């Protein structure tokens, strides 16, 4: 089927360099210009760079100009993007997308890869501090209780929370991580009836594989 798999994302300090690559499958790569588009969440989708089928023409967005170089190896069916002097603002999800070849001089992206995440931050890998979020006996909504885990101060993303692998009042709500100054912070709350509290025990299981594994309550 037509596929595009990106490789190379990671954590990178300002100054650094990284080379992403995008393996084409399912089409004769040699006939399509390839582009690299990024989505830097908060902000939007942004076109980064273009190289034609067989690299005789290339174009760059003015913001990665000078610092990135897009290239390709058509016998290896591979497209590349080498990045240099990385700034905290080139943190994005990088998509390789194919130039369409339909309408003349219309530049559209007909097939997209799933993305390679690159983080440019001075911060270093740190497991979280987890802390309990506590309900009060016969809690806050009379007949129903709320308790949670604040997994604070880690880097990079992601952390993964669990509690009560089961049924009923597995009404877990794990909020998106928010970047504090430097490091991320999220909460996982579950809503259980007030009947539960003290009667039986709830544990939240945090895990972040740039280590730490913390299971508690």
């Amino acid at each position: 089927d037509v596929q595009l798999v990106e490789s190379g994302g990671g954590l990178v300090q300002p100054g650094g360099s990284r080379k992403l690559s995008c393996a084409a499958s399912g089409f004769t790569f040699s006939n399509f210009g390839m582009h690299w588009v990024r989505q830097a969440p908060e902000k939007g989708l942004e076109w980064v760079a273009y190289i034609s089928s067989g690299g005789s023409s290339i174009n760059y967005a003015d913001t990665v100009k000078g610092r990135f170089t897009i290239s390709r190896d058509n016998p290896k069916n591979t497209l590349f993007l080498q990045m240099t002097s990385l700034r905290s603002e080139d943190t994005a999800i990088y998509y390789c997308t194919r130039g369409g070849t339909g309408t003349r001089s219309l530049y559209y992206f007909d097939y997209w890869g799933q993305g390679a995440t690159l983080i440019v931050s001075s911060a270093s890998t740190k497991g979280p501090s987890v802390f309990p979020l506590a309900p009060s006996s016969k809690s806050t909504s009379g007949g129903t209780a709320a308790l949670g885990c604040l997994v604070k101060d880690y880097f990079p993303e992601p952390v993964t929370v669990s509690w009560n692998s089961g049924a009923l009042t597995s009404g877990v709500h794990t909020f998106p991580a928010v970047l504090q100054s430097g490091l991320y912070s999220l909460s996982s709350v579950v809503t259980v009836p007030s009947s539960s509290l003290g009667t039986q025990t709830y544990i939240c299981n945090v895990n972040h594989k740039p280590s730490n594994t913390k299971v508690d309550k």
Partner: protein
């Protein structure tokens, strides 16, 4: 680098009605406009190109219409699989620019937030930081207004708040504002209040 404007960031929609997302170019791009969808998992797909040409395997329910600066996508009978966010871009002149996106959310009835306040704990105050939280649970619509008051004083700029995306079963959201202070700062005050202003009742709650 024609600025693309998608004047609507959200459309509250209901399954089966007709949805019209629009996009305006700052310069004429004369038909070189394409439309994309980014599914809840980040995946993008191209729907229409050259203003109105359907890409293969895109259901005929999608039609792109346009007049020079002004473009639109219309989903005639909205289906479950279309709750995603849509983007237009001009593919005429360098850099090819994309618009902001229009995220569709499922409309349902005004659900009022059950609010919960949670004070800090042990370990973190030992660590000298006080994170106080306010969870607003399962409400709808998404606009809620949370004001933190510390000893009746209006906190400006300490809060951060996260929102769930609309729940797959049930169509509601949930939010947490956190007020992160220090141990000195925290021990310097005695009332900590979470005031919530939502269309759930014409009354805040605390």
């Amino acid at each position: 680098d024609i600025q693309m404007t998608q004047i609507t960031s959200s459309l509250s929609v209901s399954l089966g009605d007709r949805v019209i997302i629009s996009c305006r170019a700052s310069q004429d791009i004369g038909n070189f406009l394409n439309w994309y969808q980014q599914k809840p998992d980040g995946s993008l797909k191209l729907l229409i190109y050259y203003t109105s040409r359907l890409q293969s395997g895109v259901p005929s329910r999608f039609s792109g219409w346009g007049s020079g600066t002004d473009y639109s996508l219309t989903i005639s009978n909205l289906e479950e699989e279309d709750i995603a966010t849509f983007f237009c871009q001009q593919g005429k002149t360098l850099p090819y620019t994309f618009g902001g996106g229009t995220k569709l959310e499922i409309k349902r009835t005004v659900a009022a937030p059950s609010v919960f306040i949670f004070p800090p704990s042990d370990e973190q105050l030992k660590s000298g930081t006080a994170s106080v939280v306010c969870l607003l649970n399962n409400f709808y619509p998404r606009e809620a207004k949370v004001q933190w008051k510390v000893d009746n004083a209006l906190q400006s700029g300490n809060s951060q708040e996260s929102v769930t995306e609309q729940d797959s079963k049930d169509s509601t959201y949930s939010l947490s504002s956190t007020l992160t202070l220090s141990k000195a700062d925290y021990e310097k005050h005695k009332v900590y209040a979470c005031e919530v202003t939502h269309q759930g009742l014409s009354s805040p709650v605390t």
